[PDB]
Design a protein around this ligand. Sequence first.
Ligand SMILES: COc1ccc2ccc(C(=N)N)cc2c1OCCCBr
Length: 246
Amino acid sequence: IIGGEFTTIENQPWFAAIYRRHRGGSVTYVCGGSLISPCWVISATHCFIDYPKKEDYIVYLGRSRLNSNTQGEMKFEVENLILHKDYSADTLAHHNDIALLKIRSKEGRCAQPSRTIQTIALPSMYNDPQFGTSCEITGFGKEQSTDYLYPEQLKMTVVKLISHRECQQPHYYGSEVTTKMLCAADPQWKTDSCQGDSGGPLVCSLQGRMTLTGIVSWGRGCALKDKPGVYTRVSHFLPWIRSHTK
Ligand SMILES: COc1ccc2ccc(C(=N)N)cc2c1OCCCBr
């Protein structure tokens, strides 16, 4: 997250922190995710496509810091790593950039909801917020495009949704951004999601309900003028989500 504010997990309780175990035992952060039901974390396929071994992943819930065992946090392994069959990556555009991670504790249990661990409601079909709606993003991603380290403390920011027509303008992304994708950015280009925020939530309050409207997917640079963050439009994927969680 470029700009925005440092936060804690109690303000983003659906936020999942996903890490990967390397040969030799080193653990590195991979991507964010969102808890949609006690057993299920939703994220982005691009986070995992090059390392598709479910055994390598560690998922935390109720975790506020990159290297601190937050009080009340729960640690999980991935019982099932479901990648979208039609995922593909172009120079910028990532297609069907959605993944499901079935989570299991060492005792074989799914998440236990608490003050710091909660699910995020899925959107309704054909009912996304209007362009200009303010939405929030969360993640452990870069604070600056030139950084190689990620922030130790969890961050959040607020961005505005951009219409498909504006996002398809030539100085924006042209025909590379599709109707299955949602653009969102700061009108002043000062705050944005960045590398490391992928898989994480784009949460919109719609009709008084906090909803998982999007999943951080792709973008040209970070907080760049005319280059919004591009998010997987969760409402398009409701049939795929329902079919793969059953
Ligand atoms: C590999 O890097 C990623 C991967 C996913 C992203 C997703 C979104 C955005 C954004 N500009 N909101 C940037 C992203 C991003 O950063 C591009 C610049 C890398 Br310093």
